[PDB]
Design an enzyme around this catalytic site. Structure first.
Site, PDB file in Angstrom:
ATOM      1  N   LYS A 120     -46.306  13.657  -1.212  1.00 18.65           N
ATOM      2  CA  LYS A 120     -46.115  12.500  -2.082  1.00 18.65           C
ATOM      3  C   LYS A 120     -46.866  11.345  -1.421  1.00 18.65           C
ATOM      4  O   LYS A 120     -46.607  11.008  -0.266  1.00 18.65           O
ATOM      5  CB  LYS A 120     -44.646  12.116  -2.248  1.00 18.65           C
ATOM      6  CG  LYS A 120     -44.452  10.909  -3.196  1.00 18.65           C
ATOM      7  CD  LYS A 120     -44.884  11.252  -4.623  1.00 18.65           C
ATOM      8  CE  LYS A 120     -44.949  10.027  -5.526  1.00 18.65           C
ATOM      9  NZ  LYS A 120     -46.176   9.219  -5.301  1.00 18.65           N
ATOM     10  N   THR A 121     -47.834  10.793  -2.137  1.00 24.37           N
ATOM     11  CA  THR A 121     -48.630   9.680  -1.637  1.00 24.37           C
ATOM     12  C   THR A 121     -48.029   8.339  -2.059  1.00 24.37           C
ATOM     13  O   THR A 121     -47.108   8.282  -2.884  1.00 24.37           O
ATOM     14  CB  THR A 121     -50.069   9.745  -2.185  1.00 24.37           C
ATOM     15  OG1 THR A 121     -50.028  10.017  -3.592  1.00 24.37           O
ATOM     16  CG2 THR A 121     -50.868  10.830  -1.502  1.00 24.37           C
ATOM     17  N   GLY A 122     -48.545   7.262  -1.479  1.00 25.99           N
ATOM     18  CA  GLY A 122     -48.088   5.934  -1.828  1.00 25.99           C
ATOM     19  C   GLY A 122     -49.243   5.002  -1.539  1.00 25.99           C
ATOM     20  O   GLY A 122     -49.837   5.078  -0.462  1.00 25.99           O
ATOM     21  N   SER A 153     -45.378   3.836  -3.522  1.00 23.79           N
ATOM     22  CA  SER A 153     -44.863   4.878  -4.420  1.00 23.79           C
ATOM     23  C   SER A 153     -44.247   6.097  -3.715  1.00 23.79           C
ATOM     24  O   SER A 153     -43.635   6.940  -4.376  1.00 23.79           O
ATOM     25  CB  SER A 153     -45.961   5.381  -5.369  1.00 23.79           C
ATOM     26  OG  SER A 153     -46.494   4.407  -6.256  1.00 23.79           O
TER      27      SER A 153
HETATM   28  C1  LIG Z   1     -47.727   3.814  -5.895  1.00 26.37           C
HETATM   29  O1  LIG Z   1     -48.036   3.545  -4.729  1.00 26.37           O
HETATM   30  C2  LIG Z   1     -48.693   3.538  -7.078  1.00 26.37           C
HETATM   31  C3  LIG Z   1     -49.080   4.885  -7.752  1.00 26.37           C
HETATM   32  N1  LIG Z   1     -49.159   5.931  -6.746  1.00 26.37           N
HETATM   33  C4  LIG Z   1     -50.477   5.907  -6.118  1.00 26.37           C
HETATM   34  C5  LIG Z   1     -50.611   7.109  -5.192  1.00 26.37           C
HETATM   35  O2  LIG Z   1     -49.676   7.938  -5.215  1.00 26.37           O
HETATM   36  O3  LIG Z   1     -51.594   7.166  -4.415  1.00 26.37           O
HETATM   37  C6  LIG Z   1     -51.517   5.898  -7.304  1.00 26.37           C
HETATM   38  C7  LIG Z   1     -52.897   5.286  -6.903  1.00 26.37           C
HETATM   39  C8  LIG Z   1     -51.757   7.312  -7.952  1.00 26.37           C
HETATM   40  S1  LIG Z   1     -50.739   4.795  -8.579  1.00 26.37           S
HETATM   41  C9  LIG Z   1     -48.128   2.498  -8.110  1.00 26.37           C
HETATM   42  C10 LIG Z   1     -48.974   2.484  -9.383  1.00 26.37           C
HETATM   43  C11 LIG Z   1     -48.139   1.105  -7.494  1.00 26.37           C
HETATM   44  O4  LIG Z   1     -46.779   2.831  -8.463  1.00 26.37           O
END
Ligand SMILES: *C(=O)[C@@H]([C@@H]1N[C@@H](C(=O)O)C(C)(C)S1)C(C)(C)O
Length: 265
Positions: A209-211, A44
């Protein structure tokens, strides 16, 4: 050996995966890199860049952040906390862009990719236009999260991510006003408490911004860090494992950031 290199190597050995880090002090020009040029899944994290693409379009007057985006007859993707709440009457393009970043909203992400950015190709093209030769978005949400070892789809390097973030948040691609908005959006992110934010003292201000791919223990975080009475730092941490069922480790990402910050040279 060079400050912090062995420590990051040991962290990586203990984690039993691959850690990629790039940190830069924009005040002194000192940095720290470890596998900074290797590919890691974006997960993400690319949404933080999608928001910047929207801001560039606003600035270019190719779009208006005040435009109301209607999607009352579109089914929303998994993890659409904000778009689901406002589905009946829609939300401004600005608010939708902010949600894609701050809540990693997938509905916001796919809607914006479709109607304003030109899909994965357009996202990739935008990054190319700012000098990023590494970034590549190839699939939509939530297919881009497979994180298969060796697969180059939906990947970038910690160095390229850092270069692009600095170019966007602190460069001259975005105008003064758009940068203020971008920095504000980054600062309001709600999902990074256990990552880069966890490696710095309380009085330092973080925008990130995390992923988290949810496969192969793949997780990451990038941020602009404003230390008290100091120029900003650009931090980029990406991690991955070889087991498909392995879980991500927030502590590892946070420790890699701490090491980088403490070992700039
Ligand atoms: C992206 O990697 C993911 C969403 N983003 C993470 C994050 O930023 O840590 C969450 C656990 C909040 S959900 C998906 C749902 C795969 O797009």
């Amino acid at each position: 050996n060079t400050k912090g290199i062995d420590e990051i190597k040991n962290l990586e050995t203990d984690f039993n995966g691959r850690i990629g880090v790039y940190a830069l002090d924009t005040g002194s020009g000192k940095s720290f890199s470890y596998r900074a040029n290797e590919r890691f899944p974006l997960c993400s994290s690319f949404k933080g860049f999608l928001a910047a693409a929207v801001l560039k379009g606003s600035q270019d007057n190719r779009l208006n952040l005040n435009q109301i985006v209607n999607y009352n007859t579109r089914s929303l993707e998994f993890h659409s906390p904000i778009t689901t709440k406002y589905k009946d009457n829609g939300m401004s393009l600005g608010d939708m862009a902010a949600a894609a970043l701050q809540y990693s909203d997938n509905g916001a992400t796919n809607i914006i990719l479709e109607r304003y950015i030109g899909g994965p190709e357009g996202m990739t093209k935008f990054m190319r236009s700012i000098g990023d030769e590494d970034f590549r978005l190839d699939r939509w949400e939530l297919d881009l999260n497979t994180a298969i070892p060796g697969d180059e789809r939906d990947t970038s390097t910690p160095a390229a991510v850092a270069k692009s973030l600095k170019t966007l948040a602190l460069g001259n691609i975005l105008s003064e006003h758009e940068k203020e908005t971008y920095q504000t959006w980054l600062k309001g992110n709600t999902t990074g408490a256990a990552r880069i934010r966890a490696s710095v003292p309380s009085d330092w201000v973080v925008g990130d911004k995390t992923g988290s791919c949810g496969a192969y223990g793949t997780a990451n975080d990038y941020a602009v860090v404003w230390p008290k009475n100091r120029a900003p730092l650009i931090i980029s941490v990406y991690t991955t494992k070889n087991e498909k069922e392995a879980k991500h480790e927030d502590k590892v990402i946070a420790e890699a950031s701490r090491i980088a910050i403490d070992n700039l040279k």
